[PDB]
Structure formats: C-alpha cells, structure tokens
C-alpha cells in the first residue's frame, strides 16, 4: 500500500518525498511539474534506536566517502564491501574482522537504514547560554521575565556556561560572581562594535569572567536576575524608551565570537519593544509616529526597514558562520521589529516566540518547553549541525529551504539550477530539534540512492553522526508516467510547493506561479475530455491537491495584509521549520464538531459546518479556538461544554509554541478568526480551474 509505504518511511527515515518513483529518462525529468523534493527531518524521534558507539565506516574514495548502509553489496567471505554510490570496493576495518553472516553489523540491516553514531575522541565542550535581556518594559512584564529566566537557570546542566547582558539605552555585559561588588561593562547603544574591538575592551574546563559554569555561579546569577531593575533612564512624555536592541545583539554575537567560536552556544534575546536607537533601529522615539505596517512598506513610508534588516542580516551571518544560535523572545502590545530581526533565528536554528506580555501563561509555559528533556534528562536540542547529502550520479541537488546556511561546498552533486540556499552539498544548522524539517529539492540529470549525513553536538556534549539512506525505484521505461502518477505524495508536494512560494514572497506575482503549476498538474495527471470542464476528475492520489492549493493561496502566508509585518514573519518562521503533519494544519486548519447527535467528528472548513446546536474546535497551528453556536451560547450539557476543552488541553501542551486559546460564540468579536479561515470560494475556485485544465495547455 502506497499510504503504508509513505507512513512507514516517514516514521523510520524522517523524510517524505514528492515522488517515490523518479523519472528514469531525461525526457521526463525536465517535464516534471512538481520537482523531486524531500521533506527531511534529520533528528526525528523513533522507538529507541540503539546508539552506535563505533566509527561510521566510510568509503575509501576521496570524492565519495559515503557511509556504510544497507544498499551496499557485501561479501562476508572476502571481508569486502562495494560502495553503492561510486562502486568502490573497500576493505573492512580491523574491528570488523570477526564479521559473519549470522552476526552482521547494524548499518547493513534495512531496519537500521536511519541510524546514529557516537564519536568519542575529544573532550566534550560545555553548552553556552547567553541571556540578552531588555529592560525597557513595565514592572509586571519585567518581573515575570526575571522569574522565567531564573527557572530556566535551574534546568541548565551543571557544566554549562552562562552569561548575562542587559540593555536599554546602554548595554551592560555583566562579569558574573565578582565577589561583593557585582560589576558590569557599560557600552553605548549608539555605535556598533566588532568582535575584535570588544575583545580589546573586555580583555580543565574553560570559562571566562563573563561566561562561568552553572554549578559555580547559579546562586549569584539567580540573585542578579532577581535584582534586575528597569532601565534607569527617564522616558519623557510622548516618547518611546531608547532601546538599543541592535547593539546589544551585536555585542552578544561579538562576545561569543571571540571567546568560544565553532561550538554550541545559545543567544537568548528577550525583547519588550522595538529598537529605537542605534544600528538596527526600527522606529523613532516619537510616539506620534507609529511602527511601520504592510501598507506603510508598500507605499515607501518606512525609513528604517531596509537599513535595519541589513544590520541584523550581518549579525545572522556572523553568528551562523561562527556556529551559534540566536533566539528571540518578543512580548509587547505594539510591534517589536521581527521583520528586521527575522534572519537571526531563521538562518540559525533560533526559536522565535511572540506574545502580548511576559506576564502571561502564554509566554511562561512556551519558554519552559524550550528546555524540555527526554528519557535521560537531556535537552531536545542539537548544536552546530552539518548536513551533507550524498546522491547517486544521476541525482543533483538544487538546494534546500529551511533553517540552514550553505557551507559553499562544490561537487558533482551540485545542480546548476539553485533553489533557496542552494549551490552546495553541505549545510550548517546551528540549532536543530526533533522537529526541524528541511526541504531538499533535487533534479535528475532501478533504485536511486540519497544519503543524509548530519553531524551535530548533542546536549550531553557528545558528537553524533546521523546517517539516513533512502532508496526509490527508477521508473520502468514501458510504464513511465503511470508509475510516477501512483507514487505521488499530495500532502508533501503541497508543502514543498508552499515552501517555494513563501521563499519567493519573502525574497521578491507569486500566485501566478502557484496557479500555472496547479493547472499544469491538472492537465498531465487528470482525466478529462478537451473543452469539457464537467469531465475533469482526479485520482485519489491527486484529489486533495487542489484543495490544499486553495487554502495556501488565501492563507496569511501569502496574503500579508490584514496582518502586521511581525505577524507575517512569525507565521512564515514556523512554517519553514515544521514537519509535514503540522504544516498541513497551518495551511488547512483542522475543525472538529461537538453535539449531542454523535461523538466528536471532523468537519469541513466550510460555512455550512457552522451550526447553531454544535460546538466547533478549530485547530490552527498558531491558535486553538472553541466556537459555540447561537443555541449553545446559553450532566449531559456539561459533557458537551467541556469535550472540546478537554481535547484542547491535550494538544495545548505537546505543541512547542503554545497556541493562543480563544473561547468565543456566535456574535462574539473573536468569532472573526473562524469565519476567515472557513469557506472566491472553493466551489468557484474549482470551476475556474476545470475551465483552464480542459482547454489549452
């Protein structure tokens, strides 16, 4: 079963291809409507795979150097194996001398196609956490932020290093635990500083005066964090506080750059408002002028966007080149400037959290999900990931889309047509989780092979290598398009095409390209008589693709207006990282119905699903909404009123960015969210699509 094949391959190898049967000819590779693309999750969790504590056993060829995988032909008599990528025949290492047929290594069994190795050679480096704290916020917001940071300090490993940087008008780099004086280095938030300059101005396991181990400093830091008061500078009437977010981040990046380069570090920046001073400014200090909106940026009424975006773009590349992660936790009623700072968490593996106030259950719970541990009490986060992809000689890599940076490595697996962060066989991911999903786009130029090698730093300090080797059948020449049409993953291809549309919208019409490919897909894989719209049908393999495209082109990912620029950057941020299942929920929110006439059942996202005697539970990935009809808007009536609430609580935990909860009913103001995601309309959208699919190609 093709569905069982797709399900089992995602659970084992953490990947979902747009096509599971690839074009065996050049004539069909060029004419592919949806490109051969993979939805790859390098750190997907699974039923307790045995960690391999020996060396990976690579191929003995300079260019190839692939990892031993089940696709390799072995010869247990002569103690030799043949590399499946370059046909090179290799000798087994001495630790494999006692190899036998009735006792073979793990990496050769097809069950262990995806597998993780441990490299224990060098002394493990400790984790590094740098707190970058804004102090221009209300007391109740700053006190809650302080309590949240003190709790995160109690979850850190004893070996980890910590630093503290607070800012407002000035920038303070705190020297931790310096006896009874508590000192800090003050810097102007007016001019930017390079790492070298910062190094000259500032100065067994390693530790600086500014980055000390948790087990020896946790008591002084929790007292410092407890005494952190708001920025002492007065804020005059009608003015915004002077906030130097651009310089504070450039000092945090500059600090770690000259102390611990090329090692796992997390710059967690907490923002209570926009940057009003320095490089990286978003808006002026006059309250008379509002923060820029989409209407302001289209009519060229935002003098700080491009100059501010470029500043944080350089900081993003500086930290990504060094190998550090940049987190941004923004909470304010006004906008914050995420549109200008988005490249710091996007290029690295940084998280992006957006709320209304640090003094809410929304931020507090979300912030402690960051430090969620697994079955061994270790953070579900990796550092300094290096993704290298080995392909068959017939495959070339167009590029990747998602949280990663190109290492600019050249080879015969690099394609001329580059897509996204492309033109390379290697990518750096400074931060990855069990969720981080890259979108790899391939191009053909049985059985074709693709190997994913991911080297990252575990939260324990161990260096791990995650090898995943997949194989898909080459098309039969006497049944080319027929087998290709049956191996189509309509869900994965929809998200892989959504990945392309958003990457072009965020780096600029996009909807015109999204329609020409939907019409092209209807003509090549659909059934229809020419000039007869009523004859158009779609296989069960393709039938849901037009609906996934109707919701994608109307979602907030491409219709940026009616949202703030910081909200459009936040929505696109999480979509470019999530796996398949969560990405489908973003584009097409799930909707359950609750009534006396039957148990809860999923219903369509149409206006007809909104009944008066029924309770709805719409699950947008970003918000969970419970809607009550006009009749229910008043023990049996208790089971109905709390059935969606109970189902809400369960999914209101596992999700890392805790979605905003909304309890509304008919006539309520908050019912607007349900009415805009629901429902020109799909009926008209399909009829217009059929008229173009049955007529000219």
């Amino acid at each position: 079963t093709y569905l069982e094949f797709i399900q089992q391959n995602e659970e084992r190898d953490g990947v979902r291809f747009s096509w599971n049967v690839w074009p065996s000819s050049r004539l069909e590779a060029t004419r592919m409507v949806v490109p051969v693309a993979a939805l790859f999750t390098p750190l997907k969790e699974r039923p307790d795979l045995p960690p391999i504590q020996y060396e990976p056993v690579l191929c003995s060829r300079t260019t190839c150097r692939a990892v031993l995988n089940p696709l390799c032909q072995v010869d247990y008599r002569a103690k030799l194996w043949a590399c499946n990528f370059c046909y090179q025949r290799n000798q087994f290492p001495p630790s494999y001398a006692g190899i036998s047929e009735l006792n073979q290594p793990a990496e050769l069994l097809p069950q262990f196609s995806s597998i993780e190795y441990v490299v224990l050679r060098g002394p493990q480096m400790p984790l590094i956490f740098l707190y970058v704290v804004d102090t221009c916020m209300e007391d109740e917001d700053l006190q809650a932020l302080k309590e949240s940071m003190q709790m995160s300090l109690s979850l850190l490993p004893p070996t980890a290093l910590v630093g503290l940087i607070t800012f407002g008008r000035m920038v303070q780099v705190h020297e931790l635990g310096c006896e009874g004086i508590s000192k800090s280095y003050v810097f102007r938030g007016t001019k930017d500083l390079s790492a070298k300059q910062l190094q000259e101005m500032l100065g067994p396991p390693p530790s600086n005066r500014f980055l000390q181990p948790v087990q020896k400093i946790d008591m002084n830091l929790t007292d410092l964090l407890g005494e952190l008061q708001r920025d002492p500078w007065p804020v005059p009437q009608g003015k915004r506080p002077l906030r130097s977010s651009g310089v504070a981040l450039s000092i945090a990046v500059g600090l770690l750059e000259c102390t611990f380069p090329n090692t796992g570090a997390r710059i967690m920046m907490f923002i209570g408002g926009p940057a009003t001073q320095g490089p990286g400014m978003v808006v002026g200090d006059e309250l008379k002028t509002p923060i820029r909106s989409w209407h302001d940026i289209d009519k060229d009424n935002a003098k700080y966007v491009k100059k501010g975006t470029k500043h944080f773009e350089a900081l993003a590349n500086r930290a990504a080149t060094t190998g550090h992660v940049i987190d941004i936790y923004a909470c304010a009623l006004d906008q914050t400037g995420l549109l200008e700072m988005k490249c710091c968490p996007n290029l690295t593996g940084g998280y992006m959290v957006m709320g209304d106030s640090f003094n809410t259950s929304l931020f507090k719970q979300t912030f402690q999900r960051v430090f969620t541990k697994d079955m061994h009490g270790q953070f579900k986060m990796g550092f300094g990931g290096t993704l290298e992809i080995k392909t068959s000689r017939e495959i070339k890599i167009s590029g990747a889309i998602g949280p990663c940076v190109s290492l600019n490595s050249k080879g015969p697996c690099v394609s001329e047509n580059e897509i996204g962060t492309g033109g390379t066989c290697q990518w750096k991911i400074c931060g990855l989780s069990p969720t981080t999903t890259l979108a790899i786009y391939f191009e053909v130029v049985g059985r074709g092979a693709i190997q994913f090698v991911t080297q990252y730093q575990h939260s324990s300090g161990q260096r791990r290598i995650r090898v995943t080797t997949i194989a898909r059948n080459w098309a039969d020449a006497q049944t080319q398009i027929q087998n290709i049409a049956a191996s189509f993953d309509q869900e994965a291809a929809a998200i892989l095409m959504a990945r392309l549309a958003i990457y072009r919208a965020e780096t600029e019409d996009v909807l015109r390209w999204l329609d020409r490919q939907l019409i092209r897909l209807c003509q090549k894989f659909g059934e229809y008589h020419k000039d007869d719209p009523s004859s158009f049908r779609f296989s069960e393999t393709f039938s849901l693709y037009p609906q996934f495209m109707f919701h994608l082109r109307r979602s907030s990912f491409l219709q940026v207006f009616n949202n703030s620029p910081d909200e459009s950057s936040y929505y696109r941020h999480h979509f470019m990282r999530q796996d398949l299942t969560q990405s489908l929920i973003m584009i097409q929110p799930i909707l359950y119905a609750y009534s006396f006439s039957g148990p809860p059942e999923p219903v369509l996202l149409d206006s007809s699903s909104i009944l008066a005697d029924r309770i709805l539970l719409m699950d947008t990935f970003f918000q969970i909404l419970i809607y009550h009809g006009e009749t229910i808007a008043q023990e049996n009536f208790r089971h109905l009123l709390q059935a969606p609430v109970d189902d809400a609580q369960e999914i209101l935990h596992s999700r890392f960015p805790m979605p905003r909860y909304i309890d509304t009913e008919h006539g309520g103001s908050q019912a607007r969210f349900l009415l805009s995601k629901v429902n020109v309309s799909l009926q008209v959208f399909m009829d217009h699509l059929k008229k173009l699919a049955v007529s000219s190609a």
Binding site: E138, R230, P234, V235, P236, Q237, G238, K239, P241
Partner: protein, 137 residues
C-alpha cells in the same frame, strides 16, 4: 519636558528655594527673576507664560510664588500638579517663617524635596491664564 523650579516671596522677589541641572540656564533664570519682581498682590494667582519653545507655569499662595519652566510640549496639566505638591509641602514646613527671613535662599535644604518630587513627573512610566511672557516683562 525638562526642569527649572524656583520658589520666591512675591513681595520683594526674594528667592527661597530652587533647583537646576544642565548636564541656556542664564537667560531663562533672568526672565524668572524678572517675573518675581513684577508679581504683586494684584497679579493672577495662577498663570502660564509662553516663551517660544519654553513655557513658564506658576502659582501664588500665601504671598509665595512657585514657578516652573519646561519645554512647551510638557503637559500644562502636570506642571500645575507639580507646583501643588511643592506648595503643600513648603507651606507645611516653612509657611510661617517666609515673611520673616531676609537672606536669599534661606531654604536651600528644600533642594532635596524638589528633586525627589521632580522625578515623579518627568517620567511617563511613573504617572489659569495664558499670555506671552514678553508682554509681562
């Protein structure tokens, strides 16, 4: 939205208490002493003067004047509440010794309460007549 506060006896214009911080002050301090000389027992008890980018605010109680200067953008609603806090404190502590002193600034030590009250109004995160001053001078 900045600072200049002076407390003077209305009769002879004798200064009683003031407070000034710069890091000009030389011109607006003269105009302040000009007004203290002009004020008499027929002057309006509460008034506001315009001086271009600056704006004076004063009240008069018990023959004592409480003047404050700030930029014109500073709320005139808050300027009078600032002078009211100073008046009630000054009258409660020195209201009966004012008509007897003769030294200039016989209450310099009122500098402390002026500056601690001054900071409770020049910070948004802590929460009558109008005539051009060039006419009265």
């Amino acid at each position: 939205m900045v600072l200049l506060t002076m407390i003077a006896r209305v009769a002879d214009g004798l200064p009683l208490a003031a407070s000034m911080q710069e890091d000009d002050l030389q011109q607006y301090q003269s105009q302040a002493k000009q007004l203290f000389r002009k004020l008499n027992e027929q002057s309006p008890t509460r008034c506001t003067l315009e001086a271009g980018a600056m704006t004076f605010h004063y009240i008069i109680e018990q023959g004592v004047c409480y003047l404050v200067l700030c930029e014109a953008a500073f709320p005139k609603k808050l300027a009078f509440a600032y002078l009211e806090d100073l008046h009630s404190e000054f009258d409660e502590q020195h209201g009966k010794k004012v008509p007897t002193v003769s030294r200039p600034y016989s209450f310099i030590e009122f500098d402390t309460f002026i500056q601690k009250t001054k900071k409770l109004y020049i910070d948004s995160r802590a929460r009558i007549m109008v005539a051009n001053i060039e006419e009265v001078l």
